[PDB]
Ligand SMILES: [Mg+2]
């Protein structure tokens with residue numbers, strides 16, 4: 095299909111525990127799942143040391159994900175969305191990375207792939223496409 | 233002089249308490265103190281409501297600070313610097329915003345103005361120019 | 369072919385009722401039907417609330433129409449054409465938006481698409497190309 | 505002083521009946537009162553014939569008013585303000601020319617000079633500077 | 643028409659050349675096809691329902707009286 | 715014709731850049747428009763009689779129905 | 787190096803222009819970034835074991851306190 | 859530094875030349891002064907009260923905990 099995704103940290107760390115793990119492995123292989131520069135910095139922060147980070151960036155899955163860098167219009171959009179959510183009573187959230195990932199996806203025509211309810215709060219204003227990664231039933 | 237600055241949140245919120253307040257106010261008026269898009273998002277996060285955020289962006293001093301936006305080279309440099317810190321066991325000191333502000337300054341020809349020792353840790357890796365705001 | 373159109377409000381609201389609906393939908397998909405900033409303000413004025421306006425601008429067909437903005441030459445041409453109409457006793461026929469859309473099309477190389485005889489009055493002065501939407 | 509004005513149609517037609525008429529004549533002479541291309545079209549619409557319009561544009565006061573033409577950012581701002589006012593319950597107003605004159609003044613650093621309460625509705629959102637022309641007391 | 647792209651890094655060009663050869667294509671044929679495929683993926687669909695929805699949302703554009711107000 | 719303006723101080727250039735940015739114009743498009751604006755503004759005495767003449771010619775600007783018609 | 791891409795169809799060019807505009811990039815900056823993106827994406831098999839290795843390395847992405855620290 | 863403005867119409871230049879002569883200035887000296895005066899008029903004033911107001915409005919920027927949340 096024509097659909098392409100932008101993967102948030104919340105889905106990246108939960109892929110291996112989804113019933114749809116193998117489907118997502120195949121979509122990443124086909125180049126359909128993009129990642130932001132901001133999410134790459136979050137991956138580096140989470141890694142225990144620099145060599146572990148370097149390894150992840152040179153190996154699948156991360157090496158197979160097209161990288162989406164910011165533009166001035168995306169940065170300004172994130173700020174506009176933040177301010178509009180503040181008009182509707184949001185306080186101390188959604189997070190800065192959530193706003194930047196959502197604005198990147200909105201202006202690039204990508205579906206945000208996530209496990210974070212704050213993307214619903216953003217989509218209530220923007221109407222953008224989102225997809226929640228399936229979880230293993232308890 | 234050719235010197236320009238990029239102001240971090242840590243200096244922005246402490247200007248009112250600097251003995252150099254007057255000199256910094258004059259530099260801001262002249263366009264010599266720039267700010268990032270990420271720092272603007274931090275200002276908005278802290279504001280109590282949307283009315284107050286809009287006001288802060290349209291009034292001085294923020295209305296007088298040119299905005300420095302990210303580029304692919306800057307985002308990649310932040311990640312490179314983060315990995316060097318992580319080799320030394322220091323990458324959970326400086327935050328993602330600290331890395332992005334420092335790399336923006338480094339590649340866009342600005343001095344980081346701050347009150348945050350994490351910029352000293354980054355500068356010890358990059359050799360870039362930083363300045364600590366005097367404050368009381 | 370090299371032909372491009374600039375759609376007036378009078379055609380925009382009547383597309384759903386044209387026997388040529390399918391052909392116009394295909395041209396819109398391809399970027400061949402542009403819209404002015406003034407016409408977007410007319411869409412917003414008519415919307416019942418802000419939610420509905422935001423939706424209209426982000427969904428097809430408006431999301432697929434490139435925006436043609438005013439320039440000094442266009443604003444001056446609209447005023448010149450208005451004065452020619454006024455010499456003939458006809459300048460309270462065509463509205464200010466009609467003049468601005470016609471001059472934008474004339475100077476930016478587009479055919480006005482409309483259901484408004486005021487564009488025929490303007491074209492009789494300017495010699496520009498116009499097209500009336502077929503509709504039921 | 506440093507102050508400059510953008511004159512709306514509502515003040516233009518009422519200058520001669522203001523107690524401050526002579527002060528405004530002097531400010532127009534000094535080049536401190538600008539006018540938009542949109543307001544010039546409103547002047548032409550109001551004129552009874554084309555020769556009367558041509559005369560006004562070649563004579564004071566209009567010939568002494570610097571002309572402010574639109575830019576794409578001004579047009580987009582007018583639309584943003586319209587949408588924000590719609591969120592706050594405005595319906596079928598402020599008018600399109602009021603939004604365009606206010607956005608021009610906002611982004612150009614000019615004070616709107618008017619006799620139209622809808623500029624208060626816009627300034628409740630934008631915080632921009634406005635000045636109401638003085639009227640003759642009844 | 644023709645589009646000149648200046649200052650593409652040599653490492654980007656070398657990777658594109660290797661990608662293109664694997665597909666049996668020259669560099670410029672690969673780039674042309676890649677951009678065409680991008681455009682197809684981005685293309686919007688305009689349906690009859692979209693046009694009806696717009697008409698309903700802005701029915702007032704066909705009201706001379708409301709359009710009166712709109713222009714002061 | 716082209717005009718080269720030499721030795722513009724940094725702070726003047728910074729103001730020009732901030733203005734251009736706020737309007738969405740390039741530095742050079744802004745300067746071109748500003749120079750046209752200045753050149754095209756008359757230096758002329760403005761009298762009370764001039765303001766009264768104008769009011770008689772544009773009285774319809776104070777007719778709300780006529781102005782609503784102008785914007786349909 | 788400079789690359790000249792000849793004979794781009796009008797409709798492809800229109801899509802490129804709409805994308806660039808939406809992002810606030812020039813046509814040529816957009817194309818340069820898109821070509822870098824393609825060139826820099828690996829063509830590689832992605833396995834279940836690769837996803838499990840990644841989860842062990844980045845487990846802290848699922849620690850809300852660690853992620854709040856990352857953004858101070 | 860130097861700024862080149864291309865394609866200024868001859869009628870704009872002729873008016874600027876006449877304006878400048880009346881002031882005892884060359885064309886380029888007049889343009890330099892006009893742009894400097896514009897910059898002075900546009901200049902913002904930053905007061906002690908402005909800086910206090912900002913600190914009060916975003917006191918949370920000096921709260922590591924809130925800045926924690928902000929970065930997920
Ligand atoms: Mg820090």
Ligand SMILES: [Mg+2]
Nearest residue numbers: 463466484486
């Ligand atoms: Mg009409």
